Amino acid sequence: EDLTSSYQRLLSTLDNGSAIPRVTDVAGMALPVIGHRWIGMGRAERSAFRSLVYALRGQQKPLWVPTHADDLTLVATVSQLSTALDVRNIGYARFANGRPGRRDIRIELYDGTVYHRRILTSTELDADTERVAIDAALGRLVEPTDVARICFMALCSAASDVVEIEHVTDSEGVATAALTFKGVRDDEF
Amino acid sequence: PPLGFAALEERTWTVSIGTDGPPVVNARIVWRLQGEPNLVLVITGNRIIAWTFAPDWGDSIVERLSASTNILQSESAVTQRRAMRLAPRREFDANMYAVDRERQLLDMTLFGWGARIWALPIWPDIQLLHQPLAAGSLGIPCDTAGLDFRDGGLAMLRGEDAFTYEVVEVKTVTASGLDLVRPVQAAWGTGSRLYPVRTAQLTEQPTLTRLTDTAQSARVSFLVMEPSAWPELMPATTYRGRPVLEQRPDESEDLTSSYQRLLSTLDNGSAIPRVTDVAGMALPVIGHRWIGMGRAERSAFRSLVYALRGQQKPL
Amino acid sequence: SFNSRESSLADGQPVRLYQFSRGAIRWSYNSSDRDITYQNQIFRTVPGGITDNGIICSGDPQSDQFVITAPADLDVALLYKTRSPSDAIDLVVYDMHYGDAEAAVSWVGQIGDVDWPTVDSCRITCVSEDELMDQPGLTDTYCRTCTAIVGDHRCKVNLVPYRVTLTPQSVSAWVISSGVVAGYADGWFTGGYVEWQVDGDNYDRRFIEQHAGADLHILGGTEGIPAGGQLRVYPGCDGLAQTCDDKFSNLPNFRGFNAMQGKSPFDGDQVW
Amino acid sequence: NPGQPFLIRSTPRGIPETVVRVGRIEDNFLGDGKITLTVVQDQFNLPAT
Amino acid sequence: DEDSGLLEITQEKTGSTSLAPSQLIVKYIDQIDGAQRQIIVNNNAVAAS
Ligand SMILES: [Fe+3]
């Protein structure tokens, strides 16, 4: 089932009168909302999902919810010790220059090894290429041909406490459920 | 900054204004020198980001004109009208797509700029250049008949991709071109699109639906925060000093009529009700539909709508 | 045409204008989406709009308030954010229709209270002159002291000769110190007030708790006092007859009753 | 204005031309556009004898 | 009037006549001596009913 995303904001106090309204950003921060679906096809997966649901305790316990997009694509290989990842210019510097949300990276190499990094600051280099920085190292030299996706990470928690576990066949069978996660400012800040 | 000025020497710096910064430009640059009172150069303005996404035209784009007119009627069928907003608020509803290099740009722009003023191009007013525009030329000779072009407005050239674009300030309309104050710094040949630009804001953040790994369809809705001046013209025919609607409505969708009455005070108890005619007059209600199939008809309809001012002006 | 437009059934284009005036400074605002020029005065357009709740004239000052809603960044209301201005901001409300140069006066009054319920809005409560009739009117007591504020219309004492213009030496949280006043006897300035120019022909006034040597104590703190601005300081009268005559020689106008009688009735019990 | 007398007629209600004196006033020039008045019949007079 | 500037009249307040007083006592002070004095005002028509 096709899924979409939204940027929920505390954008109240629109203050509409008769002439013209005016919207003020109380916080100037965007918390993304992401939907999730999964298929069990097994007792172990269903038990793990139930344990996860119990651990969540509704919206209380947060957890990172990586996306699965392809926002960033490499245009030049990066040495293992280099921290100057080069990506296609997508206006990142003007929009994203270091702030909570959209400042985490998952390399997700072809083999299967995934590296979690932390953006520090992005600088504009060219109308087509940039030199976004990272926190520390990459692990090895990776060419642009050996990257699948980047899938910006973001801390999120459940948006609706109620969870529907649609049992179809049996405990040892297929099952369906839907979950929605919303960004939240947490993790000591 | 510390640098001597030679006698009879004029040093002209290049004040480069970037595109990234706080929305409100509140700058006070001070040129302080010994034995001279401070000569502060104050730079003021605002920073805006233009909407450079082309929405597909598979589904009709809906333009909404809304105004406020609170009317109160007495016991008799007499109405006094108090049209409130002189310039109706304009809302645009459309659907769009983003696949190659536009999905990530759209996501970044929405996350960053969010609920802030945009520079929305008028998609229904698309226009194609007839002759190439030389770089640095002042003035774009193009049709301006029944277009949303106003003196001191904005214009936005576009190319095949989102990146290929540039915004200029239009001084006046000569009925054949657009007088410009700043020369164009890049030349686009025939085929580049021309769009009128009006300030707009995201009424509600679109709910993005994922189609595949890199693909998202959005239902973007925009509201313009600037008055939309337009001539107000009524139908040529006149009857008893009032306009007459001579247009024949479209019959594609069946239409009905009703006789609305101020038939309140039914006074239903338990035994039997009894309805009293406060005024004993019937005011009919009629529906109307039309098809433009032309720029002139659409301009005339817009002028009629502006002249109506909601329920205020009768005909 | 204003009355004709009001009676008109199709030309109704209401627009409400507000004029906030404080002496030589005027603030003009309009509720429409574009500026309006009236009587050579242009009214600014506030992003977000300015609107009221209605006018009530029921004869009860407590109930007939006028409420104004406007953004939190409104210039006239911004003054009240830190401290209420000493002078009252008179407000006059006009009514006019777009395209007509004639306007009618609807409401006249002064600011009564201002608050900022939300960051995106501000509520102003405007009061009429009728509310000033709730306070008592006795204003008379047979006590020893003067019972008159120095400089009032009853004391008839001219304070202009006693005006002292000075630049403060140092300003602290609660104390403003100046060496010029150090040459006066302790308590010379006690009971006086300090006035200085804020903008145009309007001054803000502050009373003095006590004067001792070179240090002056300001009631309610010294916040808002410019550290280098010019300040005018007037003395204060204790109210005692000896104080009134020795310092100001205004004994003939002394409104107090020092030694006429404290209790003596003519219908008591025993005179001795 | 308060205390100002004026005439009111409403044939459907069966009320002939009547002289009334204004009482409480509550008008709304902007927004609802509702001007509501409370009036009383004119019966105030101070005889000289 | 309804067509001359009247929108709607809701309250009627027909009132009553059997109630209300028949005798009224007015107390006043004479400034010549400052002694309390009173006068009596009667409503014969209402009093009979
Ligand atoms: Fe005195």
Automatic annotation (TrEMBL), chain A:
<protein>
    <recommendedName>
        <fullName>Virion structural protein</fullName>
    </recommendedName>
</protein>
From TrEMBL, chain C:
<dbReference type="Pfam" id="PF09356">
    <property type="entry name" value="Phage_BR0599"/>
</dbReference>
<dbReference type="InterPro" id="IPR018964">
    <property type="entry name" value="Phage_phiJL001_Gp84_C"/>
</dbReference>
<feature type="domain" description="Bacteriophage phiJL001 Gp84 C-terminal">
    <location>
        <begin position="187"/>
        <end position="263"/>
    </location>
</feature>
<dbReference type="Pfam" id="PF09931">
    <property type="entry name" value="Phage_phiJL001_Gp84_N"/>
</dbReference>
<protein>
    <recommendedName>
        <fullName>Bacteriophage phiJL001 Gp84 C-terminal domain-containing protein</fullName>
    </recommendedName>
</protein>
<dbReference type="InterPro" id="IPR011928">
    <property type="entry name" value="Phage_phiJL001_Gp84"/>
</dbReference>
TrEMBL record, chain D:
<protein>
    <submittedName>
        <fullName>Uncharacterized protein</fullName>
    </submittedName>
</protein>
